[PDB]
Amino acid sequence: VPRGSHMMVEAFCATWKLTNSQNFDEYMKALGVGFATRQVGNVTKPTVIISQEGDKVVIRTLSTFKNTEISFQLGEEFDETTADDRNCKSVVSLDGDKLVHIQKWDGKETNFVREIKDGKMVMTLTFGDVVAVRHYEKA
Numbered sequence: 001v002p003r004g005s006h007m008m009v010e011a012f013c014a015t016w017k018l019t020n021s022q023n024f025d026e027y028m029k030a031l032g033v034g035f036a037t038r039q040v041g042n043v044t045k046p047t048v049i050i051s052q053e054g055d056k057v058v059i060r061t062l063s064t065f066k067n068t069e070i071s072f073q074l075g076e077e078f079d080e081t082t083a084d085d086r087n088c089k090s091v092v093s094l095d096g097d098k099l100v101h102i103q104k105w106d107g108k109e110t111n112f113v114r115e116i117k118d119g120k121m122v123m124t125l126t127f128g129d130v131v132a133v134r135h136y137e138k139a
């Protein structure tokens with residue numbers, strides 16, 4: 001909403017390759033992801049391209065499994081079909097220097113907080129009391 005926001009989004013705008021993942025299996029289980037999708041998801045190393053296109057922010061994920069693309073305005077709810085095939089109502093906002101993505105579906109909620117730390121993009125994924133953390137490096 002406030003000014004400076006697209007300047008802060010620009011810090012995330014790059015091509016990001018997964019370089020580490022911690023507790024993603026447990027997060028997927030808590031989320032309700034099916035066994036086959038967990039088997040693939042625990043091994044695949046996605047590339048995430050974040051860009052600005054107009055006043056739209058775009059997050060494109062490429063992998064050897066699922067490719068996804070979402071396009072949104074900060075703070076504006078949108079429909080999202082996730083890589084694990086959930087049909088959600090989502091909102092992406094800024095919280096200071098953090099890009100926060102909240103997904104709502106079936107009376108449930110999960111969120112992904114992205115931040116730049118030591119030049120890497122670090123994603124914290126939370127569902128209830130279960131948290132996973134994924135690191136990405138610029139390509």
Ligand SMILES: CCCCCCCCCCCCCCCC(=O)O
Nearest residue numbers: 033041044046048063065066083084
């Ligand atoms: C893109 C392939 C991953 C498939 C795993 C599906 C499990 C869904 C859990 C939420 C997805 C968000 C993070 C996974 C992709 C990423 O590294 O950005």
